Structure 1
Amino acid sequence: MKELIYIHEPNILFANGQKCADPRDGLALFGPFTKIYGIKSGVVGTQYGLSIFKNYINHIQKPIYNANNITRPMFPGFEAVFGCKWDADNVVFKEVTKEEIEKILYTESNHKRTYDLVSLFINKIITANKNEDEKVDVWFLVIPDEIYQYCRAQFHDQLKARLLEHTIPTQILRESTLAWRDFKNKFGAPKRDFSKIEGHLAWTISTAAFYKAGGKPWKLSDIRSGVCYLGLVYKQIEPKNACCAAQMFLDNGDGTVFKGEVGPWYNQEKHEFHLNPKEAKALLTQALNSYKEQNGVFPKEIFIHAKTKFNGQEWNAFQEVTPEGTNLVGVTITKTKPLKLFKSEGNYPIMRGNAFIVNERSAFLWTVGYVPKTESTLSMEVPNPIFIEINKGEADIEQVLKDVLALTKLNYNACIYADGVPVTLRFADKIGEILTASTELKAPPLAFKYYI
């Protein structure tokens, strides 16, 4: 008999310092951590898209009922949850004619096809951000469905990177999503059925729009102070590897500064997924300065986590640039080792939070499982745990497990109970996907609002 320890669920802050374990609950009961005055929408799409968008924004002002109200919480309504106004009558609409799509659509070269479509949308946004005297908050690109699959070097990835030099928050919404009732695969039933998850859909879009407009729907408070949780993700470039980083830490006022610390730190080496001594020193130095300016003092340890193991030379580079009194922790979080724990009797999979301490330097942690409060698994079947191993440095295998589970509570791109992998490893994945999708920008923005 091997004994499984249980990791308590960390709490995410909300309004009035109140804490709840579910963002959908702490928002509904208490509201966002910081409120914005309102959101001024901006729509770049066809006349059909604008009507749908105006329909949907007006739809989510009022409470929304999904079939299974017991398990997944209902949506009280946008102004009811967040406190701000999101009006569909304040839309700075920029029409894109359907015929204009056709001429770009017929270009032979795929490179010219995707680039012209990206240049189509961003140019209207960029011009409307220089000529219009309207202070648009979030630019919503209701893209027609022909754009998605005829254009298929990614439309979505290209668009975000080219807007980085202008710092324009955008929220791409496929028309098949906002008008899901009106898109069927000739059977009469929707291509995707959102009927039972209407509140789930409305929750996710609203907090995304709320976040991109300068709002902070929630923040974390269950981390050890003085720690700079830095996450590294490597992306293949075609023999080039880019390694963006995302950092998360508490400021002096107990505020999480969840930002990036990014750049295409390139590895033209035959051995992949590692960093040269030159590149690795710059990466850790950047995060050290960012904490230095954000808090005044240096971190007393840096919690470096990644999905890849670290060799000696790059770790040595970290040691060389690391100041005195600061520890290093290298954590490798992978989702590959099959360790399926079927429950003895019953039909609901293993509960989230169970952890198997393999030894003093490794563990298996169940970030995905059965969540009691939501009463409906974010998964469907037996969930694979994530293998968490202390690759380098001296750290407590139980304290690391708590922190890794803690980092799974900062997903702003969705308002789910928790994410399977730590978000810092997921957001840095999104950043690397976005950045490299175009030419090398001298300085990327460090606000996730421009990537997610």
Structure 2
Amino acid sequence: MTFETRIFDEPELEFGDHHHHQDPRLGLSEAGPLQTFLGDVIKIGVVGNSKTIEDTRKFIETVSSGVEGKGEKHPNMHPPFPGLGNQSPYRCRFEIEDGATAALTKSKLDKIGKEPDHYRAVEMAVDEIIGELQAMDDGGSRPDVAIIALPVKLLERVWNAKAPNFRGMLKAKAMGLSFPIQIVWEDVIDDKVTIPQKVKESSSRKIQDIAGRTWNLMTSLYYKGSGRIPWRRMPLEGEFSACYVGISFYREADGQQLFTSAAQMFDERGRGFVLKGRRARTESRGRHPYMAREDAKKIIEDVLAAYKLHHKTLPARVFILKTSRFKDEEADGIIAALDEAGTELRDLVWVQESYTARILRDGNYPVLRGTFVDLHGKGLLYTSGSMPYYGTYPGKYDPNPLLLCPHHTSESTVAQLAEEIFSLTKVNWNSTQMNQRLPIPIRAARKVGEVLKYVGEGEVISADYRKYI
């Protein structure tokens, strides 16, 4: 048997003034963001210790004027950050206001530090932080995005040396405030400090140098503060209207219950790309990663209603990505919930990250990004690999490629859908990295499920994506 293969060109993304480039950093540098900001200032708030507030201000004033990257071996992999001055990528200024200076007390950290019950320490720490943030939101000093950068002293007596998380219930509680939060471990804002790891206590974590962290955190802060999207994937000329839904899975904070997760995105009329979640919690029925009928039907109803509310028309094509097997328990419900609304095209793809076979080529380098092989219906696609642009391989071992398994109800061929998700992988607003592997709806649903894993019942969830990355 001879297997047909395919090579896809690296996709280009939209930017300001109808620009098109394949690199988010360079696309922001030449053109600016896709949507500009009417205001010219973004207000930042700091929560933590006095030293951490100081070094957060030092971090902002350090990266305002621009800080270069790393060695000259790969100039395309670590571009310099041109700062926030005259030639800002975001064309806005980022200021810390004087009314948001939340400094914690050493007596409280001595108090919480007591570890009789580890669970109550996490709960009362998170409750006191959220109470102080709520007290800050009440006054006339509302920030836009709050850095809540944790100190070494509090975190080491709650995370490693004591088992619940921190980020999960912390963002589960920071849900009524009219601004998102961003946790910053102390190494990011101050590079002189070294924080030891938990299990290999002799060893410790290693991070990037300066500017990659600067790029990722500044893009995250801009998207959280302004609310205007930095980039989106460029639509093709003469293409139909499409809608992307993704479904992921998780386990709760108990023994034997699984609760599932979802995410959703589409396009706007003028120039935009929405990306949201759902305001309703998902309950449990069993422990297999399955969907039943009413869950899939109400997911499709929600996403179609949210498209119709924005475009005043139903979409012409629905694209759904899952992680477990696409069986007939829920595919009948999906297809019925599509045909009651008259949407013609329909694609349903199971994504497998659990395979047992790879592809081997000559030389010391593996296959490039986007290499496609067709296994008689299976769509084996390498969403990572070597880079003609980054100039090298950013990894150690052979990458585990995605296995496309389209459902037999799907419309398009296995080669078009892989190119579509190959375009869809680089719409990660967390970072500016190019070597994304999982597609963005599965990634977004995983983030939503990780946040919703610890949400208490009766709490209203937010569909705004700024509280998730």
What's the TM-score, normalizing by structure 1? 0.92
Q: Which amino acid aligns with 1:218?
A: W
Q: d(CA) in 1 for partners of 2:173 and 2:308?
A: 30
Structure 1 distance, partners of 2:212, 2:61, is 17
Match of 1:103 in 2: 111
Q: Which residue of 1 aligns with 2:358?
A: 340
Shift, 1:339, TM fit: 3.3
Deviation at 1:3, TM superposition (A): 4.0
Give 1:274 shift.
Answer: 1.1
Structure 2 counterpart of 1:92: 100
Measure, in 1, the Cα distance between the counterparts of 2:460 and 2:317. 27
Matches within 5 A, 1:72-221: 72=77, 73-79=79-85, 80-88=88-96, 90=98, 92-130=100-138, 132-152=139-159, 153-183=164-194, 191-194=204-207, 197-213=209-225, 214-221=227-234
- Determine the structure 1 residue equivalent to 2:68: 65
1:266 aligns with 2:256: no
Q: How many Å separate the matches in 1 of 2:362 and 2:460?
A: 54
Q: Report whether the alignment pairs 1:275 with 2:268.
A: no
SS at match of 1:305: strand
Query: Contact 2:43–2:94 at 8 Å: present in 1 too?
Result: yes
Cα shift at 1:283? 1.4
The secondary structure found in structure 2 opposite 1:252 is coil
Q: Tell me the C-alpha RMSD between the 2 structures.
A: 2.3
8 Å Cα contact 1:71/1:376 also seen in 2: no
Distance 1:331 1:167, change over 3 A: farther
What residue number does 1:405 align with? Answer: 422
Q: Within 2, Cα distance between the matches of 1:376 and 1:103? A: 50
Which segment is superposed worse, 145-154 or 432-441? 145-154
Q: For structure 1, which segment, 426-435 or 314-323, has the greater mean C-alpha deviation from structure 2 after superposition?
A: 314-323
Cα distance in structure 2, aligned partners of 1:163 and 1:78: 28
Change (3 A) 1:149 1:377: farther
Three-state SS of the structure 2 residue aligned to 1:5 is strand
Give the match for residue 297 of structure 1: 313
Q: Which moved more, 1:134-143 or 1:232-241?
A: 232-241
Aligned residue in 1 for 2:28: 27
Structure 2 counterpart SS, 1:414: coil
How many Å separate the matches in 1 of 2:13 and 2:106?
Answer: 44
**Following the alignment from structure 1 to structure 2, what is the Cα–Cα distance between the partners of residues 29 and 192?**
34
Q: d(CA) in 2 for partners of 1:380 and 1:443?
A: 43
Runs of at least 4 residues off by over 4 Å: 88-91, 189-195
Contact 2:314 2:343 in 1 (8 A): no
In structure 1, the residue matched to 2:412 is 395
Is the 2:3–2:374 Cα contact (8 Å) retained in structure 1? no
Q: From the superposition, tell whether residues 207 and 336 of structure 1 become closer, same or farther in structure 2 (CA, over 3 Å).
A: same
Question: How many correspondences in the alignment?
Answer: 445
For 1:190 and 1:24, locate their aligned partners in 2 and report how far apart those are by CA, in whole Å.
33
Return closer, same or farther for 1:150/1:367 CA change in 2, 3 Å cut-off.
same
For 2:229, the aligned partner's letter is: K
- Per-residue Cα deviation, 1:350-393 (whole angstroms, up to 9, x for no partner): 2111111222x321111111122222434333222111110242
Aligned equivalents of 1:182 and 1:190: distance in 2? 14
Gaps of at least 5 residues in structure 1 are none
> What's the offset of the Cα at 1:107?
3.9
Over residues 312-363 of structure 1, what are the superposed CA-to-partner deviations in whole Å (9 max), with x where a residue is unaligned?
1211112222222433321111222133334312x3332111111222x321
CA distance in 2, matches of 1:84, 1:259: 25
**Contact residue 353 and residue 366 of structure 1 kept, 8 A:** yes
Supply the AA of the counterpart residue of 2:189: L
Equivalent AA in structure 2 for residue 278 of structure 1: E
1:343·1:350 contact (CA, 8 Å) conserved in 2?
yes
Q: Alpha-carbon deviation of 1:8?
A: 2.0
Q: Which shifted more, 281-290 or 96-105? A: 96-105
Unaligned ranges ≥5, structure 2 = none
